[PDB]
Amino acid sequence: MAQIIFNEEWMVEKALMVRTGLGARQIESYRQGAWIEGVHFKRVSPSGEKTLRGTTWYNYPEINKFIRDSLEHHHHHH
């Protein structure tokens, strides 16, 4: 254990597509599948209480880990 460092690569929707190289349509399609709340992203509101205006921040390491599957082309479906 050298030092407890955290992956603070949290970024909003429009920022994420720029950092990863994806588009809004491809990300929303992923949110209908691979993007899981609590796992690959979380809900950050401009307050301490429960609001539906809570901005969603996505995890870059989690997403690059997912995309890695397509780069690591492997015949997964028979």
Side-chain angles (χ1 to χ4, degrees), residues 2 4-6 10 16-18 20-21 23-25 27-28 30 34 38 41 43 48 51 54 58 60 63 68 73:
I4 307 299
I5 303 178
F6 301 96
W10 300 83
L16 189 281
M17 65 181 62
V18 180
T20 56
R25 182 183 64 181
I27 303 178
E28 72 170 292
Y30 287 150
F41 63 87
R43 304 297 297 253
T51 64
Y58 305 97
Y60 188 75
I63 298 175
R68 184 181 303 158
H73 57 112

Side-chain angles (χ1 to χ4, degrees), residues 5-47:
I5 303 178
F6 301 96
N7 300 92
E8 56 182 81
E9 283 295 276
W10 300 83
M11 55 192 65
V12 300
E13 184 182 292
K14 181 262 295 179
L16 189 281
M17 65 181 62
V18 180
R19 299 283 284 202
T20 56
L22 281 55
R25 182 183 64 181
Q26 193 178 331
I27 303 178
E28 72 170 292
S29 178
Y30 287 150
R31 294 187 299 223
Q32 299 170 29
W35 273 217
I36 302 178
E37 185 179 84
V39 181
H40 289 348
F41 63 87
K42 80 191 309 297
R43 304 297 297 253
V44 175
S45 300
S47 178

Side-chain angles (χ1 to χ4, degrees), residues 46-77:
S47 178
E49 299 178 277
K50 55 187 295 179
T51 64
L52 297 310
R53 299 296 190 172
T55 307
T56 299
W57 299 68
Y58 305 97
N59 292 269
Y60 188 75
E62 291 291 280
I63 298 175
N64 288 32
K65 200 286 297 183
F66 175 72
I67 301 177
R68 184 181 303 158
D69 183 272
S70 296
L71 284 57
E72 300 297 284
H73 57 112
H74 50 257
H75 185 257
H76 63 272
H77 189 80

